[PDB]
Every structure is written in C-alpha cells, then in structure tokens.
Coordinates of C-alpha atoms in Angstrom, one line a residue:
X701 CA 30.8 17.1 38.2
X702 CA 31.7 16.2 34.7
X703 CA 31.7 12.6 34.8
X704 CA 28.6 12.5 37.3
X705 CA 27.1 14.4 34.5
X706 CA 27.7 12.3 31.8
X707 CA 27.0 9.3 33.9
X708 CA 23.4 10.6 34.8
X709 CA 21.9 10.9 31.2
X710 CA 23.6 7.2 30.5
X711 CA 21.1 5.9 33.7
X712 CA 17.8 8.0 33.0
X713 CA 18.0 7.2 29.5
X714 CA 18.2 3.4 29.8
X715 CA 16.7 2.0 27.4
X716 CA 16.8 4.0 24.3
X717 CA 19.7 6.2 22.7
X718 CA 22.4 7.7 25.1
X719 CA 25.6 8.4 24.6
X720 CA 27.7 5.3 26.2
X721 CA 25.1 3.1 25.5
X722 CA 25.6 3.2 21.5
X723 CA 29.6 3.0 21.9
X724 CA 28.6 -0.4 24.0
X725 CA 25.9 -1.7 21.3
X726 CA 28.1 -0.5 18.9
X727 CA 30.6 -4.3 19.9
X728 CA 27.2 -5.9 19.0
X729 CA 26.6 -4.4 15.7
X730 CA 24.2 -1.7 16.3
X731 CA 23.7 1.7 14.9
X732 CA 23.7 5.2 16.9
X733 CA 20.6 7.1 16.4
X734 CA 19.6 5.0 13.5
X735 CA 18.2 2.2 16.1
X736 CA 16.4 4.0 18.1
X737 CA 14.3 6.0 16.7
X738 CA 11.1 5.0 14.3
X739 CA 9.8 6.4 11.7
X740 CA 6.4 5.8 9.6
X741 CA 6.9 4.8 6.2
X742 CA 3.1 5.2 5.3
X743 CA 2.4 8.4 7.6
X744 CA -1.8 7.2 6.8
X745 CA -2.0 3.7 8.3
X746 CA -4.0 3.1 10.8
X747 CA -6.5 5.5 11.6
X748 CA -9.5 3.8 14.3
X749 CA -12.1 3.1 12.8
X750 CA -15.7 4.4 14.7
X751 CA -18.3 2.0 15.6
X752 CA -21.8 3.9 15.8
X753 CA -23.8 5.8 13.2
X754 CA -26.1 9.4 13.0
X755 CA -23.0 11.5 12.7
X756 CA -24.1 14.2 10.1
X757 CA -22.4 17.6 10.5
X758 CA -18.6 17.1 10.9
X759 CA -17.1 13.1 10.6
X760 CA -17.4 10.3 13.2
X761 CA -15.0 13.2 15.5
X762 CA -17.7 15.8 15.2
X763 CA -19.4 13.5 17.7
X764 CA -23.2 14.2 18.4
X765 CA -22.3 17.8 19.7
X766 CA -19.8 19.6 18.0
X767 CA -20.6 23.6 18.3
X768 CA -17.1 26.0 17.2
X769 CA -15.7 23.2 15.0
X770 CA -15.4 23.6 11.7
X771 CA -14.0 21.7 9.1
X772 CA -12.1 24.6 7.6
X773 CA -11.3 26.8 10.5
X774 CA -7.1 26.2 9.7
X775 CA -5.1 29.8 9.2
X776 CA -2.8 30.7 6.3
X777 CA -0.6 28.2 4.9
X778 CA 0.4 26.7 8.2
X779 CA 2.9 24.0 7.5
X780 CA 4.6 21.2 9.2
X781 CA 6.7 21.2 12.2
X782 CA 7.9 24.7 11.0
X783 CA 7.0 28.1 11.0
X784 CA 6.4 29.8 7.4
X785 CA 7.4 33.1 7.0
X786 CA 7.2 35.8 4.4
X787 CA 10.8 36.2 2.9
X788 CA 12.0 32.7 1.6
X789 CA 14.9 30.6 3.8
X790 CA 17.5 28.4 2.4
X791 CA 16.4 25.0 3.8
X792 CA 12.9 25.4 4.0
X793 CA 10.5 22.3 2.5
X794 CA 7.9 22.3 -0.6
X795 CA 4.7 23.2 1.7
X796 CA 6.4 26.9 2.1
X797 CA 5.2 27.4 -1.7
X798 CA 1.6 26.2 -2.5
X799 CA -1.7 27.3 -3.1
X800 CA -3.6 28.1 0.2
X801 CA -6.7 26.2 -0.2
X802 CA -6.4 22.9 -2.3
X803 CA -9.8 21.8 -4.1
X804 CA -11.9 18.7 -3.9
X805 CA -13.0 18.5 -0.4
X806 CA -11.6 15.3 0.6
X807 CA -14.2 13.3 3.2
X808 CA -14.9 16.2 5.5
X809 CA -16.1 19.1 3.2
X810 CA -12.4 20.6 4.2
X811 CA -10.1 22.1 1.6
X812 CA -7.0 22.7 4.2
X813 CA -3.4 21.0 3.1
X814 CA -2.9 18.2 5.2
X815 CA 0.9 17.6 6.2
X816 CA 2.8 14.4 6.2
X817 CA 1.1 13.2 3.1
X818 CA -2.3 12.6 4.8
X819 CA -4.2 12.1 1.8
X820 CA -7.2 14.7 2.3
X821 CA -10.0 12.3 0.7
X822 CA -9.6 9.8 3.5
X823 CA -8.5 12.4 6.5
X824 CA -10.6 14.4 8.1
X825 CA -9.7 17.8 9.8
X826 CA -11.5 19.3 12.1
X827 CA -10.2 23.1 13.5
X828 CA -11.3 26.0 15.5
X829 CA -10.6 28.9 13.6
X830 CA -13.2 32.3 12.8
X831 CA -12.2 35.3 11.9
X832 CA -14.9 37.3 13.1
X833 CA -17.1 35.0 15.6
X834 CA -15.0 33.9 18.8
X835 CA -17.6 31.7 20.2
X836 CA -16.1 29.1 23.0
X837 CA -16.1 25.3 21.3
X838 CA -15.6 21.9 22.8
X839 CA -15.5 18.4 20.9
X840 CA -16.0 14.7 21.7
X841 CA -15.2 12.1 19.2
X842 CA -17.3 8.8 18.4
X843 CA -15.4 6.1 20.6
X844 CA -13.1 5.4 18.3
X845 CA -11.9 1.3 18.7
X846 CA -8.6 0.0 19.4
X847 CA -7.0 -2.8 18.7
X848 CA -6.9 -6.4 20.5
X849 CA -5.4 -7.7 23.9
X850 CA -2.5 -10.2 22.4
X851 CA 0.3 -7.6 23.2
X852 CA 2.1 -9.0 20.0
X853 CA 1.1 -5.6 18.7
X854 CA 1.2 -3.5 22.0
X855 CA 4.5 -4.5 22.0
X856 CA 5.2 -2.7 18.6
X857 CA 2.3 -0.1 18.9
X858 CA 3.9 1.9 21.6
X859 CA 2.0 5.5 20.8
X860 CA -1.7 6.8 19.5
X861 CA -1.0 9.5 17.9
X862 CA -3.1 12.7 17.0
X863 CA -1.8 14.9 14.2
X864 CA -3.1 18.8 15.4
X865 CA -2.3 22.2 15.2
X866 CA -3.1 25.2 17.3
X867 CA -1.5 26.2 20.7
X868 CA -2.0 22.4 22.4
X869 CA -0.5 21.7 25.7
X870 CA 1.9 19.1 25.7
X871 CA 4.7 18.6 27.7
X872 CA 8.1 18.6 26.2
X873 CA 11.6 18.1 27.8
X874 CA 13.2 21.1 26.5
X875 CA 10.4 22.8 27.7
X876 CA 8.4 21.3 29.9
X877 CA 4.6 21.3 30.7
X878 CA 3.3 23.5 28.4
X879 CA 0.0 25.3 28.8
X880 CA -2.8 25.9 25.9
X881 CA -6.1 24.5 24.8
X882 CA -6.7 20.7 26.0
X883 CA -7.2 18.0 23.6
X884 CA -6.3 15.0 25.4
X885 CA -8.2 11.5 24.7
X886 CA -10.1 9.6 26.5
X887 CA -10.6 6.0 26.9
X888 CA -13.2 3.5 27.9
X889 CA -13.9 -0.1 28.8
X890 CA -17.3 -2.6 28.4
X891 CA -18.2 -2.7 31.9
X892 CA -21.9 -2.6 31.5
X893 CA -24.1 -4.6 29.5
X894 CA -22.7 -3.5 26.1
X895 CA -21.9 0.2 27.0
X896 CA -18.9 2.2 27.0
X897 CA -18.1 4.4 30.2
X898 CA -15.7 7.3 30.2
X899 CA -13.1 7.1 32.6
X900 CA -9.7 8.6 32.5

C-alpha cells in the first residue's frame, strides 16, 4: 500500500515537482521546489489591453452594461491570501496595519488597497459590495485582446490570470470544486466579417 502510494503521486504528477522525480533531476543539476514553480517578478505586467471605445461609467470591464458594480464596493481591510483579524499574529504581513481607504483614486475613481503591488493608478477594481442595497449584478468586460499565434510565447505564457476577491468558485485540489459566485472568462474568435462571437 505504501509504495503503490508513493508510486502513484510520482505518475499523476509527471511533469512538474514530485517527490522522486527531484531526487532523479537532482543527478542533472536541478533544484527541488525551486524549479518548478514560477513566480512574477513585476506582479503588473501585462494587463490586455481593450480594443473599442464609449465606456464611461466603470473602465473598459464595466462593459456597456454594468448594473451592481461598483468601483469601491471592497469590505474592511481585506488583504492578500490571508485572513485579517482583530488581535495581531506573529507572522502576519504589512497589509494587516494600514489605513482602510488609500487616497488618489487611481484610474477607476477606486480608493481600495490593491494587493501584490498593483499600482492603483494603472489598475482598475471593480467589486460588488453595498451595505444597504443588495440588488443582483452581472458584468461583461470589453473583449479584452490576447496575444499572437507563434506559440514562442504560449509556450511561456501558460495562465491568464484574474486577481479577485469575494467567495469565487474555483476548483482546488485540497478541496475540490468549489461553489460561489461565477466569474469565469470568455473567449472569442473573428469568424465574421470583423466581429467577435462568444463562444465558450
């Protein structure tokens, strides 16, 4: 049971990390852990840029209909991939002490502290959050672009990622599918004569 345990995870996991496939690279000069996983130097780099116009309310993710979002619905001093409590904790980061609503509006008339150094004057948030009106609220954002067909940079590109907050979905392995409010994207091809279609 043991060793058909151990030689399981070494199989499902192939490629990336496991356990007895780090010992092997290990002949080859490789690291553990500090191979395969990737981090973002410059957590602001990239960011789609939108092709059309006439987006006056919220950004180019407002769309042309957004009704319930608001660009400073976010709760109290939420932080990042933690939970901030009232009583201090030993390890905790610098975003458990800071003032609640940061000035100067960045791009999206929002004042909420953006995590992983986002820098607010080029990011902009978008939550559903009201104190007192619970009206129901959808979004659709404006079609953002992606990048080209050489796979040179598909290759290296493997994610789009969307910072957000809230009670999302997902679906995690410790967990599993995990249910919430949707926010999935979706994409689109020029089938048409110069026209976008959503499908998937």
């Amino acid at each position: 049971v043991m060793m058909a345990s151990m030689a399981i995870g070494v199989v499902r996991q192939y490629p990336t990390y496991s356990n007895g496939w780090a010992n092997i690279r290990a002949f080859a000069g490789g690291c553990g852990l500090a191979d395969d996983v990737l981090v973002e130097p410059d957590s602001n780099a990239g960011f789609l840029t939108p092709l059309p116009g006439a987006y006056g309310p919220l950004g180019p993710l407002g769309g042309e209909d957004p009704q319930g979002f608001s660009p400073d619905g976010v709760p109290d001093r939420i932080i990042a991939e933690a939970i901030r409590l009232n009583n201090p904790q030993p390890g905790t980061d610098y975003d458990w002490n800071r003032p609640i609503k940061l000035d100067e509006p960045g791009i999206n008339g929002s004042t909420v502290p953006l995590p992983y150094g986002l820098d607010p004057k080029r990011v902009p948030v978008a939550g559903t959050y009201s104190t007192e009106a619970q009206q129901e609220s959808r979004l659709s954002s404006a079609w953002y672009e992606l990048p080209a067909r050489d796979e040179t940079e598909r290759a290296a590109h493997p994610l789009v990622v969307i910072t957000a907050a809230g009670t999302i979905t997902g679906e995690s392995v410790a967990n599993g599918l995990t249910t919430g409010q949707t926010v999935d994207l979706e994409y689109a091809t020029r089938g048409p004569d110069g026209t976008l279609v959503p499908a998937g």
